[PDB]
Design an enzyme around this catalytic site. Structure first.
Site, PDB file in Angstrom:
ATOM      1  N   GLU A  81      -4.248  -8.989  -2.260  1.00 33.78           N
ATOM      2  CA  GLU A  81      -4.909  -7.772  -2.618  1.00 33.78           C
ATOM      3  C   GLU A  81      -6.407  -8.007  -2.320  1.00 33.78           C
ATOM      4  O   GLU A  81      -6.879  -9.111  -2.515  1.00 33.78           O
ATOM      5  CB  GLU A  81      -4.755  -7.707  -4.117  1.00 33.78           C
TER       6      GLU A  81
ATOM      7  N   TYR B  65       2.223   2.860  -3.069  1.00 34.66           N
ATOM      8  CA  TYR B  65       1.310   3.729  -3.779  1.00 34.66           C
ATOM      9  C   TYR B  65       1.282   5.133  -3.275  1.00 34.66           C
ATOM     10  O   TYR B  65       0.545   5.956  -3.819  1.00 34.66           O
ATOM     11  CB  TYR B  65      -0.131   3.152  -3.860  1.00 34.66           C
TER      12      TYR B  65
ATOM     13  N   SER C 121       0.805  -1.221   0.000  1.00 36.50           N
ATOM     14  CA  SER C 121       0.000   0.000   0.000  1.00 36.50           C
ATOM     15  C   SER C 121       0.836   1.269   0.000  1.00 36.50           C
ATOM     16  O   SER C 121       0.443   2.296  -0.598  1.00 36.50           O
ATOM     17  CB  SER C 121      -0.968   0.011   1.193  1.00 36.50           C
TER      18      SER C 121
HETATM   19  C1  FSU Z   1      -6.661   2.834  -7.340  1.00 37.61           C
HETATM   20  O1  FSU Z   1      -5.885   2.074  -8.302  1.00 37.61           O
HETATM   21  C2  FSU Z   1      -6.333   0.721  -8.344  1.00 37.61           C
HETATM   22  C3  FSU Z   1      -5.245  -0.172  -8.917  1.00 37.61           C
HETATM   23  C4  FSU Z   1      -3.880  -0.003  -8.217  1.00 37.61           C
HETATM   24  N1  FSU Z   1      -3.781  -0.675  -6.860  1.00 37.61           N
HETATM   25  C5  FSU Z   1      -3.699  -1.976  -6.556  1.00 37.61           C
HETATM   26  C6  FSU Z   1      -3.627  -2.084  -5.207  1.00 37.61           C
HETATM   27  C7  FSU Z   1      -3.510  -3.178  -4.464  1.00 37.61           C
HETATM   28  C8  FSU Z   1      -3.458  -3.087  -3.060  1.00 37.61           C
HETATM   29  C9  FSU Z   1      -3.496  -1.785  -2.507  1.00 37.61           C
HETATM   30  C10 FSU Z   1      -3.602  -0.633  -3.308  1.00 37.61           C
HETATM   31  C11 FSU Z   1      -3.560   0.597  -2.566  1.00 37.61           C
HETATM   32  N2  FSU Z   1      -3.967   1.801  -3.077  1.00 37.61           N
HETATM   33  O2  FSU Z   1      -3.086   0.516  -1.431  1.00 37.61           O
HETATM   34  C12 FSU Z   1      -3.666  -0.824  -4.654  1.00 37.61           C
HETATM   35  C13 FSU Z   1      -3.732   0.004  -5.706  1.00 37.61           C
HETATM   36  O3  FSU Z   1      -3.807   1.332  -5.682  1.00 37.61           O
END
Ligand code: FSU
Ligand code: FSU
Lengths: 350, 342
Positions: B319, B238, B235
């Site tokens: 996820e 990101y 997470s």
């Molecule tokens: C908002 O974009 C969706 C696709 C990208 N993904 C996949 C994913 C997996 C696990 C956690 C997160 C997160 N924001 O913590 C995300 C994320 O942003």
């Protein structure tokens, strides 16, 4: 001398044709000097699929360029290609691997056909090769209602975008694969049984008839296929007919009609690389922008024959122009007919 | 009059300059589309073009049809490359880079619209319609929260160490009541969601949302849901922090997972099959189920990374995705520090 009907004999010659098997491999750019037909093996094909599965993983889970490059080298070492002076495609994306997956699917079937061809006695060779298919094959009468309904399905479900060729039905065969009746028995009972198309290269039919339609091996990458590892069918004849991979250089092909027990469909508009269905589901329907007119639908024996002409479906936000149907258990299918088609490739745009 | 670590938060997420910089880093042309002129509807049209491109590619439309859509995209969202060629939008990878950018712009526009509409710090608070309180460094809440941070930092995300700084307890007005029916569902779990700071004003006034109808479902590995991780570092990746900018924000959210659809590879869906209430993408590594805690029907998976026996997967780590905004209840907002080697 064989007593088999002449259309059946001609079918046998088509299926067991070494020269078409070679042509097939050359279309995939396999170097036949380095890997002749006779030197193809199951193990080699299994390992190649293993490499594609590793490649896709290494890409998904962010391996380094060096590793991707090494895996590509390994693939092309195991399956020799002759690319002329063209840059050999790195296997570093979904597209490049899906293309190799399709080649391997066909290599596997060619190995099976060449094996079957080279096995057994050296009676009439036609009868010797007929018996190898373990399938009762009857010629359907041109004037039967059976034949008319089938020519109508071909005529009406040819998609407007598959406009390079017209199809003409040469022979129609009723087929029953040894032991498939019994295998299908339990699914005979399932709702939503449909008579659908499956197209394949002509020599793949040695394996298809002797072993039936099969799911890709466990080594094959599930991500290799739009809807994962199942058995694919179309309701538009031309979508399947493209999988015959015929040309003006070789314009006769073969296509199956099969009864498939769909049950409850999991309806999807975009890729879903699954290997199993969620509980409640017996098949996938990939939704196309165009669907056979359900006004024109007929049914016999509780089986639907979607022979209406293509009309806009509700659906615009889809990855598919036309429907497709996937089952994940080989027993869900019962092959019914095999059609010999001449593809008449068009010379005018008007 | 608001507390200090809170006051810092308000300034940080309503920072007009960070918004400007995110835009420049995407090579948006700020003379033709300045922050003040960002339109939600313009972003939605851009998303719509990305949908068309992806469908044109999949359906096998002509190269000229695709080329036209790619030019249309750049008509709509003015870029400044300014000597180089705008990348061709004709493959899932180029399209994917633009999806992620639009996801950010949509949120930036939300923030800016808030700030423009209607002590400015407390005018801003009012507008977030979210109650925020600081959590005691010493209190039990913080000790569990710090342990989850520490245990779940994945080993392949080694470029940095993390350390907590402030912990905020959050209550979005209306969110408990929205979540009410879903509280009954089983498998409720406390999970992470990372985002960039330019995204957090939108997230607090509006909650975690799903991409709009115009966005391509194929732009996201499991389609249009809300994504959560059980590894803090998956997470926190990101957050998009750097040596030069090492402070990020992260959410802890209560998510009603229910009956999970367990998947190993991409599935671009916008709805679940009957009987499924979420997707779990299966990772090669999963927190130890032994160290799991349950607190009034909510699991907190703060075990250390152990192998799942699942090796034929597209995912290093798990996820979780839900497809209804009401399945999430935001609990905590954390402010963290990234310690890069190098
Ligand atoms: C908002 O974009 C969706 C696709 C990208 N993904 C996949 C994913 C997996 C696990 C956690 C997160 C997160 N924001 O913590 C995300 C994320 O942003
Ligand atoms: C056999 O490999 C499956 C992947 C490629 N696909 C997809 C697909 C859709 C509809 C019909 C067919 C068919 N063969 O008639 C196929 C087909 O071969």
């Amino acid at each position: 001398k064989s007593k088999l009907p002449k259309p059946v004999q001609d079918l046998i010659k088509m299926i067991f044709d070494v020269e078409s098997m070679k042509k097939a491999m050359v279309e995939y750019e396999i170097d036949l000097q380095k890997m002749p037909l006779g030197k193809l093996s199951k193990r080699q094909i299994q390992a190649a699929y293993s490499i594609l599965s590793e490649v896709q993983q290494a890409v998904s889970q962010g391996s380094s360029d060096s590793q991707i490059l090494d895996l590509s080298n390994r693939f092309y070492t195991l399956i020799p290609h002759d690319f002329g002076m063209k840059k050999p495609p790195l296997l570093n994306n979904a597209d490049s691997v899906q293309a190799k997956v399709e080649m391997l699917d066909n290599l596997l079937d060619i190995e099976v056909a060449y094996s079957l061809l080279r096995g057994g006695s050296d009676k009439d060779p036609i009868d010797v090769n007929y018996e190898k298919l373990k399938t009762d094959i009857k010629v359907v009468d041109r004037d039967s209602e059976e034949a008319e309904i089938i020519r109508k399905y071909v005529k009406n479900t040819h998609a407007t975008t598959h406009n390079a060729y017209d199809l003409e039905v040469i022979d129609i065969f009723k087929i029953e694969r040894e032991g498939e009746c019994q295998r299908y028995k339990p699914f005979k009972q399932l709702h939503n049984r449909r008579l659908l198309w499956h197209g394949s290269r002509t020599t793949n039919f040695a394996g298809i008839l002797s072993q039936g339609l099969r799911i890709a091996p466990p080594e094959a990458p599930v991500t290799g296929y739009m809807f994962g590892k199942g058995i694919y069918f179309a309701d538009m004849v031309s979508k399947s007919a493209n999988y015959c991979h015929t040309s003006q250089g070789d314009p006769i092909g073969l296509i199956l009609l099969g009864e498939v027990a769909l049950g409850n469909m999991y309806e999807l508009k975009h890729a879903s690389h699954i290997s199993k269905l969620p509980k409640g589901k017996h098949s996938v329907k990939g939704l196309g922008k165009t669907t056979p007119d359900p006004s024109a639908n007929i049914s016999l024996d509780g089986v639907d024959v979607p022979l209406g002409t293509g009309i806009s479906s509700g659906v615009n936000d889809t990855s598919l122009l036309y429907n497709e149907y996937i089952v994940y258990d080989i027993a869900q299918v019962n092959l019914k007919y095999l059609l010999k088609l001449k593809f008449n490739f068009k010379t005018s745009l008007w």
